[PDB]
Amino acid sequence: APPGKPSLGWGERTFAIVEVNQAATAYNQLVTKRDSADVSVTWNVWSGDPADKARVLLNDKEFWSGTGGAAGSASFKVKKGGRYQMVVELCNADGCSQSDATEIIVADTDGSHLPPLDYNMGEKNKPFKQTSGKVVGAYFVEWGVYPRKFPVDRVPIPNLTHLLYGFIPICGGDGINDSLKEIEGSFQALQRSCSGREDFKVSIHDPWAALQKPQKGLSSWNEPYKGNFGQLMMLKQAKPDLKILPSIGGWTLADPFFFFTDETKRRRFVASVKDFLQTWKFFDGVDIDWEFPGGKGANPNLGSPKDGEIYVLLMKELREMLNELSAETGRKYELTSAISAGWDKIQVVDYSAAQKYMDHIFFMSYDFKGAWSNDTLGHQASLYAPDWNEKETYTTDFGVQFLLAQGVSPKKIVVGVAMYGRGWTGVHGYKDNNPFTGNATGPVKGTWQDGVVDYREIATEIAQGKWEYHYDKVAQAPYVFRPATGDLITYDDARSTIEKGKYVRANKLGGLFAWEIDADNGDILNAMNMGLGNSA
């Protein structure tokens, strides 16, 4: 004669270890990290013999015990997220009885409550297997879910080992993040994101795109995590070994790095990163995109020769931080950084000193030339120098050799590929039918910006005969040219991308990475995988 079978009371069935306010605009009002969720359950007895023991089991394992054998309740902590079958069990001296199972969702930022990502193999992407052991990385931009319409589910995830999230901002007002002011709405949007947040703490630039914007599979208005971050959790469920790293900085967010002479602000930043990864568990480490140590970044007023020493100090403490984060969670975290490929920036830092803490170096072998100059035309990401200027120092090969001369192990170096074109208009005064020898009247009309074109657009317009295509065989670089108007764009295509893969294998380098994933029609990432030796 066991107790009567209990019946569970109607109540909340979704609980969050990490709470997310779906309508907040300040970061500290947006998320609240906790070590566990507080799950509650009620039940009704009908036989009314105050049984000696009640229990609450989730997937047949005990999470709580108490003596509520007369229509009672229970609260208890659940520290690991997921979908749980909840059952209430009552016992007397004769035996036990168990209520019907109801499902509860204990959400956490590792995606343990979500199904795998339903990703698209769209356009010209074709599937590969990561067999080479080489790094195949790409940047996913936070603002890509707006007119670009490139959510995380568009990322061809079997063709990557690393996905970099650009960007995670460091918070500060006038004097700390003035590079943002050259983009309308951005500086103020960062101020809104950090209303009441300590300066030099990490944050989220766009909380709407990151966590609140409805996306594929994450639209129900009580979904704890939506936006890019929620999809990234489902990405982790799809390919658990794909590394997802937050990219702190970029071109317009690197200014707060220069104030890290003050160790007080460096400890605050490093500590905020630890709390950031505990809060957002789907990230597998940290990518530091200080652009650049010593200066010559977006802001012409910061930079110092001392920055090289502090760049190593930052890597040291971040690594120690990740090591004690490993001691808590048992996971392996990665420390990477996107660094300049120009020698005048490399020499600012002794990378042989920083490399002991770093897993990979994301060598930005692009942006060598651009529409920021009407006179200095050239290849933006070529492998070698062109014959018309053999002593060109801003090449992939020259940068790699300069970095190797510092004593950097070849395995840590990951070569950059440009999924975009930088270009000019009105190129005139050129000789030898070489448009690079002339000058420009301004930037080329671009996809989302003056002087920047998506490769997808370059490829489409080439098929439609709108461009006169050329390949610099010596420098290993393609470029399109319209003679009637002076339009000239330099970029990476499948041929030059394959040549970068050969170069990485011939020199025992780490692999390839590309900016940005939403600017590719599939051809570039295809060539990255083929050029590195992966199986199709």
Ligand X SMILES: Cc1cccn2c(=O)c3cc(C(=O)NCc4cccnc4)c(N)[n+](C[C@H]4CCCO4)c3nc12
Q: Which of 291, 317, 499, 516 is catalytic?
A: 291
CB of 342 to ligand X, least distance (A): 9
The interface with ligand NAG within residues 170-209 (CB under 6 A) comprises: none
CB of 451 to ligand NAG, least distance (A): 10
Residue 198 known to be catalytic = no
Q: Does residue 372 belong to the site contacting ligand NAG (CB under 6 A)?
A: yes
Binder to ligand X among 31, 312, 338, 528 (CB under 6 A)? Answer: 338
- Work out what residue 241 binds among ligand X, ligand NAG, none; the CB cut-off runs from 5 to 8 Å by kind: none
Q: Does residue 289 belong to the site contacting ligand X (CB under 6 A)?
A: yes
What gap in Å lies between CA 225 and CA 455, rounded to an integer?
32
The interface with ligand X within residues 438-477 (CB under 6 A) comprises: 449, 451-452
* Shorter beta-carbon distance to ligand NAG: residue 120 or 374: 374
Q: Does residue 373 belong to the site contacting ligand NAG (CB under 6 A)?
A: yes
What gap in Å lies between CA 435 and CA 422, rounded to an integer?
14
Q: Does residue 36 belong to the site contacting ligand NAG (CB under 6 A)?
A: no
The interface with ligand X within residues 105-164 (CB under 6 A) comprises: 139
SS3 assignment for 299-343 = CCCCCCCCHHHHHHHHHHHHHHHHHHHHHHHCCCCEEEEEEECCH
For the record, the structure tokens of 194 come out as 């950090």
What gap in Å lies between CA 254 and CA 292, rounded to an integer?
7
CB of 467 to ligand NAG, least distance (A): 22
Q: Amino acid identity, residue 165?
A: Y
- Work out what residue 251 binds among ligand X, ligand NAG, none; the CB cut-off runs from 5 to 8 Å by kind: ligand X
The interface with ligand X within residues 251-270 (CB under 6 A) comprises: 251
* Shorter beta-carbon distance to ligand NAG: residue 98 or 434: 434
What gap in Å lies between CA 375 and CA 369, rounded to an integer?
10
* 235 three-class SS: helix
Q: Using CB under 6 A as the criterion, what x/- string covers residues 235-254 for binding ligand X?
A: ---------------xx---
Q: Does residue 441 belong to the site contacting ligand NAG (CB under 6 A)?
A: yes
Helix (H) or strand (E) holding 479: strand 477-482
Q: Which stretch binds ligand NAG (CB under 6 A): 80-88, 155-163, 195-203, 435-443?
A: 435-443
- Work out what residue 442 binds among ligand X, ligand NAG, none; the CB cut-off runs from 5 to 8 Å by kind: ligand NAG
Residue with nearest beta carbon to ligand NAG: 429
Binder to ligand NAG among 35, 174, 241, 375 (CB under 6 A)? Answer: 375
DSSP 8-state symbol, 372: T
- Work out what residue 374 binds among ligand X, ligand NAG, none; the CB cut-off runs from 5 to 8 Å by kind: ligand NAG
CB atoms within 10 A of CB 430: 17
Buried b (16+ CB within 10 A) or exposed e, 218-254: beeeebbbbbbbbbbbbbbbbbeebbbbbbbbbbbbb
CB of 451 to ligand X, least distance (A): 6
Q: Does residue 367 belong to the site contacting ligand X (CB under 6 A)?
A: yes
Half-sphere exposure of 514 (CA within 13 A, CB side): 35
What gap in Å lies between CA 404 and CA 408, rounded to an integer?
5
Judged on CB neighbours under 10 Å (0-12, 13-18, 19+), 340 is buried
Binder to ligand NAG among 94, 442, 449, 473 (CB under 6 A)? Answer: 442
Binder to ligand NAG among 304, 406, 439, 447 (CB under 6 A)? Answer: 439
- Work out what residue 499 binds among ligand NAG, ligand X, none; the CB cut-off runs from 5 to 8 Å by kind: none
- Work out what residue 452 binds among ligand NAG, ligand X, none; the CB cut-off runs from 5 to 8 Å by kind: ligand X
Buried b (16+ CB within 10 A) or exposed e, 117-137: bebeeeeebbebebebebbbb
What gap in Å lies between CA 47 and CA 49, rounded to an integer?
6
Helix residue ranges per DSSP H, 164-249: 186-193, 207, 227-238
Q: Amino acid identity, residue 440?
A: A
Give me the residues that bind ligand X (CB under 6 A), please: 139, 250-251, 289, 291, 338, 364, 367, 370, 372, 449, 451-452, 515
Annotated catalytic sites, by residue?
A: 291
Give me the residues that bind ligand NAG (CB under 6 A), please: 372-375, 429, 438-439, 441-442
